[PDB]
Design a protein around this ligand. Structure first.
Ligand SMILES: *[C@@H]1O[C@H](CO)[C@@H](O[C@@H]2O[C@H](CO)[C@@H](O[C@@H]3O[C@H](CO[C@H]4O[C@H](CO)[C@@H](O)[C@H](O)[C@@H]4O)[C@@H](O)[C@H](O[C@H]4O[C@H](CO)[C@@H](O)[C@H](O)[C@@H]4O[C@H]4O[C@H](CO)[C@@H](O)[C@H](O)[C@@H]4O)[C@@H]3O)[C@H](O)[C@H]2NC(C)=O)[C@H](O)[C@H]1NC(C)=O
Ligand SMILES: *[C@@H]1O[C@H](CO)[C@@H](O[C@@H]2O[C@H](CO)[C@@H](O[C@@H]3O[C@H](CO[C@H]4O[C@H](CO)[C@@H](O)[C@H](O)[C@@H]4O)[C@@H](O)[C@H](O[C@H]4O[C@H](CO)[C@@H](O)[C@H](O)[C@@H]4O)[C@@H]3O)[C@H](O)[C@H]2NC(C)=O)[C@H](O)[C@H]1NC(C)=O
Ligand SMILES: *[C@@H]1O[C@H](CO[C@@H]2O[C@@H](C)[C@@H](O)[C@@H](O)[C@@H]2O)[C@@H](O[C@@H]2O[C@H](CO)[C@@H](O)[C@H](O)[C@H]2NC(C)=O)[C@H](O)[C@H]1NC(C)=O
Ligand SMILES: *[C@@H]1O[C@H](CO[C@@H]2O[C@@H](C)[C@@H](O)[C@@H](O)[C@@H]2O)[C@@H](O[C@@H]2O[C@H](CO)[C@@H](O)[C@H](O)[C@H]2NC(C)=O)[C@H](O)[C@H]1NC(C)=O
Ligand SMILES: *[C@@H]1O[C@H](CO[C@@H]2O[C@@H](C)[C@@H](O)[C@@H](O)[C@@H]2O)[C@@H](O[C@@H]2O[C@H](CO)[C@@H](O)[C@H](O)[C@H]2NC(C)=O)[C@H](O)[C@H]1NC(C)=O
Ligand SMILES: *[C@@H]1O[C@H](CO)[C@@H](O[C@@H]2O[C@H](CO)[C@@H](O)[C@H](O)[C@H]2NC(C)=O)[C@H](O)[C@H]1NC(C)=O
Ligand SMILES: *[C@@H]1O[C@H](CO)[C@@H](O[C@@H]2O[C@H](CO)[C@@H](O)[C@H](O)[C@H]2NC(C)=O)[C@H](O)[C@H]1NC(C)=O
Ligand SMILES: *[C@@H]1O[C@H](CO)[C@@H](O[C@@H]2O[C@H](CO)[C@@H](O)[C@H](O)[C@H]2NC(C)=O)[C@H](O)[C@H]1NC(C)=O
Ligand SMILES: *[C@@H]1O[C@H](CO)[C@@H](O[C@@H]2O[C@H](CO)[C@@H](O)[C@H](O)[C@H]2NC(C)=O)[C@H](O)[C@H]1NC(C)=O
Ligand SMILES: *[C@@H]1O[C@H](CO)[C@@H](O[C@@H]2O[C@H](CO)[C@@H](O)[C@H](O)[C@H]2NC(C)=O)[C@H](O)[C@H]1NC(C)=O
Ligand SMILES: *[C@@H]1O[C@H](CO)[C@@H](O[C@@H]2O[C@H](CO)[C@@H](O)[C@H](O)[C@H]2NC(C)=O)[C@H](O)[C@H]1NC(C)=O
Ligand SMILES: *[C@@H]1O[C@H](CO)[C@@H](O[C@@H]2O[C@H](CO)[C@@H](O)[C@H](O)[C@H]2NC(C)=O)[C@H](O)[C@H]1NC(C)=O
Ligand SMILES: *[C@@H]1O[C@H](CO)[C@@H](O[C@@H]2O[C@H](CO)[C@@H](O)[C@H](O)[C@H]2NC(C)=O)[C@H](O)[C@H]1NC(C)=O
Ligand SMILES: *[C@@H]1O[C@H](CO)[C@@H](O[C@@H]2O[C@H](CO)[C@@H](O)[C@H](O)[C@H]2NC(C)=O)[C@H](O)[C@H]1NC(C)=O
Ligand SMILES: *[C@@H]1O[C@H](CO)[C@@H](O)[C@H](O)[C@H]1NC(C)=O
Ligand SMILES: *[C@@H]1O[C@H](CO)[C@@H](O)[C@H](O)[C@H]1NC(C)=O
Ligand SMILES: *[C@@H]1O[C@H](CO)[C@@H](O)[C@H](O)[C@H]1NC(C)=O
Ligand SMILES: *[C@@H]1O[C@H](CO)[C@@H](O)[C@H](O)[C@H]1NC(C)=O
Ligand SMILES: *[C@@H]1O[C@H](CO)[C@@H](O)[C@H](O)[C@H]1NC(C)=O
Ligand SMILES: *[C@@H]1O[C@H](CO)[C@@H](O)[C@H](O)[C@H]1NC(C)=O
Ligand SMILES: *[C@@H]1O[C@H](CO)[C@@H](O)[C@H](O)[C@H]1NC(C)=O
Ligand SMILES: *[C@@H]1O[C@H](CO)[C@@H](O)[C@H](O)[C@H]1NC(C)=O
Ligand SMILES: *[C@@H]1O[C@H](CO)[C@@H](O)[C@H](O)[C@H]1NC(C)=O
Ligand SMILES: *[C@@H]1O[C@H](CO)[C@@H](O)[C@H](O)[C@H]1NC(C)=O
Lengths: 187, 144, 188, 147, 188, 147
């Protein structure tokens, strides 16, 4: 295609996979499995599932901080995810498990304008490319899946659907602690 | 605050998909020091920062993302990503930061600043959707 | 007014009320009554006065969150107000109930360099349009005769008699959140 | 970082609803093009806010109950918060400041070309007369003559 | 030096010490002692050292706030320092004494990605000019031989014997307050 | 958000108090006007800080005890903190960086007109040689002849 006679239209596509060494990269396998590659060796897995893996209502972050067995980058990423949730006020909707340096978090997404809506909005912001599978309305978005599970994992050939991209995490970095409610007077 | 990172331009094979040594002139990359709503300049700053990070800084035993958490604001305008998200939710074309388009003279090497190919409804927009933008760009090229 | 020979001077005046459906609009009725409409149905009422409404040093924030029953926009606005208070260190000044899903917050403003002046600073920055009636040289050393600041929900009527509605106070203060807060614990 | 929102439909026109007792007013492409570059323009920030309001009511489906999360995200993209900070800083020192209410522009009698509106300043809780900042109007007219 | 004949190169050095009344000024006396002017009457003394002063694992910031016997500017600077620490998770590391209204905060700095590394990363930025003395390619895995970092309050004297005063470094750290904190509870 | 603070006065002059033994240093409209648009200039940020200090001390009554709430609000309006972040990034990376102390400008001997000062970059525990950044000086001279 030529414009004004002499000019010719040409394109490029940026390879957002060489940035793994310094930038978390969102990613998607299928509608019920998305991924965040923190490094070549390790990453986080975000699934939307009917079935749960944490059957209790304890997160218990303080003991995990005291033990200090978890991976710091993964903890930072899930902290960015949680603090990015707008108007999180139901603590019982979240449970966790950090035994032996593990990272596992569960958001109970069990109608318009609730905690599940905020968790889902942060989910589609984190995995921006591929989460649209799981428009017109945004103020309350709902999926048939009941639970959102965040876990640690080893990195593999996970990006089957959408290309990797750092844009979701870099966009959520600026949004931390913007819509959090007050829970204590002295804060 | 406004971005500041100096783009210490040539895109290598590793930075690109199915391409080899796309090099833009000084005039094209000079617009990244002033333009604020250009996705390509932000990604250029990100790639240059990644390059200098792997080259200069010693790799840690275990990876950490403190440095990117600190330099994200200097390397890129987060509000551009915010605007792209806003266009994404409102069911109108947006940029996912992957594909860009520019114009080169067939007789000279002088290129324009690449602009993002807007995606809409899960697919790239046709060239006829934003042909007016291409013509306006070429008009500014002949004028400038 | 003619300038040079052809340039006419004309003026605009933007109508902020059309922005009601998408943003809060800070307003002002008089010096002792200010309003924040969130849409056309509801809003907050910020009054400086001398009479108590809350007579207990409690604020059930956690139980209020657990029970929900409140308007989320109003909760977020009062959260933005509280987090924007510079240099807050006296929890007993703040009181609230939130029973039945309502919203009712009281700041106990009863010297230079205290917690009351920060509350007045944020109060003026919220109702930027008409809080000036409630000196420039005495900044960060401000004081008012009024003892209490009551932030309580209300249904919406035409309250803007002194100054026009405007979103600029809330939008400008959204960047103030968690900026001057002290640390109360070793892990935040 | 910086604003990025772009107005949609190459000048821009404020309708009757967007103005207090005034008909529809259109500003050409030349004046609106200044809003892409300049950062200390209150009027451009208000244009971005009004355009975003128009798009939000037009496109997004209305919720069951109002939510202000959208502006809580988009405030930094639509406006320069530090411009409001400068306005507040001039407010607390009794320097003249803009409360984003009133604006003024030069308008050519014959051609109809207009400069970018500059915000009218208030001090003592009242609009400054046309005499206090007449130097600003004359220098803006010099700029508009140079074009 | 004349560049291209007509032009002459000239230099100016800003006296940033005159910005004392409006904003604090970081400065360095030696690799072991750094200072922060807050006006000409007081400031903070940061010291990497081997001898502790606290000798307990208590940081009663909440009792310190309730009593309200401290300087608010110094407490805000301490809050900016503590919040700016990237990935602080060992509450036992920090222990502070605010008895009688004073300020005294000790970080126990006793391998990449440790709490001592984050504390030193913030320390090198708070005193940005001249803390490098305390292999420039190693950033994430910085570890100094000193065992503790002690931040006290002190009446100001001419402590600048190695580096000039500079407001830059506190202004930089103001923008990194709540950008790397880990979550410690389900509700913040 | 983008900085917005406007220097008060045309041109701008730094008195001897603001400088380490350099008397009055005055810059014309050409250099000062660049600070409205240029974002990656340390000297313009320092000019805004010094002007804000002057305005604050002369206008606002000093408090009984010093409070730094004012600068905590105005830090993002007076300076580009991302410039400080960039300088820190170059400091840790061992790239040359600016510690905001020393600046250099090209002074026209006859007309007396000067360019906008650029910061003298620092490394190795000292200031660089003029030979290292002579390319920057040559480019500045090339720009300053070409208008
Ligand atoms: C996370 O991100 C990093 C980048 O930050 C990325 O590392 C890069 O991986 C790519 C491959 O995906 C590497 O690309 C290869 O580069 C070499 C040249 O090496 C350069 O980089 C190394 C490492 O820094 C330097 O030491 C060296 O001096 C160079 O700078 C090329 O020779 C390779 O070319 C091969 O592929 C081409 C395209 O198909 C072929 O045309 C070419 O002929 C080569 O293929 C043939 O030769 C190969 C070598 O013998 C052979 O293996 C093949 O089978 C075939 O015969 C190629 O471009 C890049 O260098 C890496 N850079 C760094 C800094 O590590 C990680 O891969 C990424 N990780 C994840 C999870 O994806
Ligand atoms: C930014 O946005 C652009 C545009 O959306 C993305 O580019 C597309 O990326 C998607 C996902 O990677 C591509 O979809 C894939 O297409 C493959 C076939 O491509 C060719 O054939 C199709 C028609 O069949 C043509 O339309 C296309 O142009 C090619 O000629 C499929 O084989 C892939 O299958 C995968 O997804 C399907 C479901 O859709 C699964 O059932 C499969 O099992 C498998 O997971 C897939 O459909 C799309 O082709 C790309 N378009 C172009 C032209 O580039 C960028 O990836 C995106 N970038 C980022 C980082 O967000
Ligand atoms: C998170 O902690 C709870 C609470 O544990 C107790 O209190 C802590 C502060 C600490 O002092 C622990 O040692 C205490 O045990 C854990 O729930 C406990 O589970 C054990 C084992 O079944 C049981 O004996 C205790 O009674 C429980 N405590 C309570 C208060 O009910 C919980 O298991 C921890 N989370 C995880 C994921 O292990
Ligand atoms: C919540 O605060 C209440 C007091 O709050 C007020 O009274 C309540 C009955 C309700 O109307 C609130 O909206 C009001 O703001 C605390 O109630 C008492 O707490 C004490 C301990 O301080 C306890 O011994 C008493 O049994 C409680 N009840 C009464 C009637 O005094 C309550 O503890 C706070 N916490 C929770 C979780 O509710
Ligand atoms: C820091 O506080 C602890 C805990 O005491 C409580 O919190 C204080 C701030 C204050 O509110 C007290 O009234 C509370 O009891 C102090 O530890 C106590 O010390 C006293 C005196 O030795 C002892 O009798 C108590 O049993 C201790 N309580 C506990 C829970 O250990 C501590 O003294 C304070 N820090 C320092 C350095 O003194
Ligand atoms: C996720 O939330 C749902 C909804 O609250 C929980 O399901 C409830 O479980 C309780 C306790 O057994 C029952 O009384 C309710 O009737 C259930 N409600 C529904 C709609 O199923 C569910 O248990 C929660 N899951 C976890 C792991 O906490
Ligand atoms: C998530 O993290 C945990 C803890 O690191 C992983 O389980 C550990 O695997 C390492 C391998 O060296 C062992 O040394 C630890 O003792 C294990 N701890 C536990 C929790 O058993 C776990 O494998 C990681 N997640 C996945 C799916 O790989
Ligand atoms: C809230 O503002 C909306 C617009 O955002 C107002 O709706 C407009 O009202 C005017 C009244 O003159 C009508 O001409 C317009 O057609 C309306 N527009 C839309 C999109 O509805 C509404 O009136 C305002 N409500 C209140 C209570 O002030
Ligand atoms: C708000 O705080 C003031 C003090 O700042 C309270 O007034 C005090 O009330 C106690 C009650 O025992 C008296 O002993 C004091 O003398 C009062 N102080 C003053 C200065 O009058 C007031 O009661 C508080 N209000 C509420 C509603 O709790
Ligand atoms: C900005 O300031 C001007 C000047 O004070 C305000 O104009 C006043 O508005 C009120 C409310 O309608 C009127 O009662 C006054 O008569 C107006 N005075 C003048 C001089 O016209 C204006 O309302 C303010 N705007 C905002 C949004 O705060
Ligand atoms: C703190 O800064 C003030 C204000 O810049 C300094 O006071 C100035 O002192 C110089 C000489 O040092 C005089 O020429 C100025 O007239 C003074 N200005 C004012 C407004 O008083 C003061 O010296 C500084 N103090 C310290 C201890 O550094
Ligand atoms: C700072 O922390 C270190 C450990 O990180 C403390 O040193 C330990 O002290 C305990 C006291 O029971 C000894 O049993 C350990 O052997 C010590 N470990 C090492 C490596 O020296 C140190 O005492 C702490 N300092 C303070 C002031 O609390
Ligand atoms: C910026 O860096 C320069 C060069 O390292 C510093 O210059 C030193 O300043 C001290 C101040 O007491 C003098 O004693 C040294 O002799 C100076 N060194 C040289 C080589 O001239 C300067 O202080 C730094 N400025 C800031 C604000 O940190
Ligand atoms: C650049 O050089 C010129 C050369 O004249 C400087 O002019 C000075 O002007 C002042 C009055 O404004 C006189 O008192 C000085 O004697 C002049 N200096 C010289 C060397 O002749 C001018 O100030 C310089 N500009 C800057 C910004 O430093
Ligand atoms: C992961 O990266 C390391 C270097 O950081 C490399 O040695 C190792 O082979 C890589 N493993 C992969 C590519 O899975
Ligand atoms: C310049 O145009 C030529 C000829 O079509 C093309 O090969 C080249 O890619 C263009 N320049 C760049 C930087 O892509
Ligand atoms: C070209 O764009 C038009 C206009 O939307 C579209 O209908 C058509 O399919 C596009 N052409 C392709 C995909 O080849
Ligand atoms: C506040 O809202 C509650 C319901 O949450 C309602 O009962 C109450 O009347 C409202 N307050 C006012 C003053 O209207
Ligand atoms: C500008 O002036 C012309 C001529 O008076 C008039 O037709 C036009 O409507 C005016 N436009 C504005 C923006 O007021
Ligand atoms: C208006 O503000 C100025 C500056 O503070 C003040 O001097 C003046 O007295 C005020 N208005 C009047 C006339 O009271
Ligand atoms: C200037 O403002 C005053 C009110 O402060 C007004 O009376 C005067 O008429 C204005 N200027 C002129 C000369 O019209
Ligand atoms: C740094 O200066 C202080 C001033 O009291 C001194 O005590 C300390 O010993 C000095 N540093 C060293 C390690 O010599
Ligand atoms: C710190 O402040 C306290 C009062 O809060 C004072 O008594 C003490 O002397 C100060 N510290 C120093 C070293 O002067
Ligand atoms: C930079 O300067 C330091 C301090 O003088 C010196 O030790 C170091 O060798 C220098 N490095 C290089 C590469 O010149």
């Amino acid at each position: 295609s030529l414009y004004k006679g002499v000019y010719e239209l040409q394109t490029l596509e940026l390879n957002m996979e060489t940035l793994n060494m310094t930038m978390p990269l969102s990613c998607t396998k299928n509608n019920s499995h998305h991924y965040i590659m923190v490094g070549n060796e390790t990453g986080l897995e975000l699934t939307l599932t009917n079935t749960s893996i944490i059957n209790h209502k304890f997160c218990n972050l303080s003991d995990a901080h005291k033990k200090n067995l978890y991976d710091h980058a993964l903890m930072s990423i899930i902290s960015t995810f949680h603090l990015s949730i707008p108007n999180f006020n139901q603590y019982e909707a979240m449970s966790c498990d950090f035994n032996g340096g593990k990272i596992s978090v569960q958001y109970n997404l069990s109608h318009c304008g609730t905690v599940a809506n905020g968790v889902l909005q942060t989910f589609m912001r984190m995995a921006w490319g591929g989460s649209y599978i799981a428009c017109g309305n945004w103020d309350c978005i709902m999926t048939s899946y009941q639970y959102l599970i965040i876990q640690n994992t080893t990195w593999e050939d996970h990006c089957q659907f959408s290309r990797p991209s750092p844009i979701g995490y870099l966009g959520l970095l600026s949004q931390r602690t913007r819509d959090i409610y007050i829970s204590r007077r002295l804060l | 605050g406004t971005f500041t990172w100096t783009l210490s331009y040539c895109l290598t094979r590793w930075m690109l998909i199915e391409a080899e040594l796309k090099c833009f002139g000084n005039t094209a990359v000079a617009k990244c020091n002033e333009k604020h709503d250009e996705e390509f300049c932000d990604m250029l700053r990100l790639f240059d920062f990644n390059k200098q990070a792997i080259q200069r800084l010693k790799a840690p035993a275990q990876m950490s993302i403190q440095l990117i958490n600190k330099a994200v604001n200097a390397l890129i305008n987060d509000q551009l990503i915010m605007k792209n998200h806003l266009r994404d939710i409102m069911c109108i074309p947006y940029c996912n930061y992957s594909k860009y388009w520019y114009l080169n003279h067939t007789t000279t090497g002088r290129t324009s600043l690449p602009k993002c190919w807007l995606v809409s409804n899960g697919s790239y927009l046709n060239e006829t959707h934003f042909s007016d933008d291409i013509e306006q760009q070429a008009d500014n090229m002949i004028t400038e």
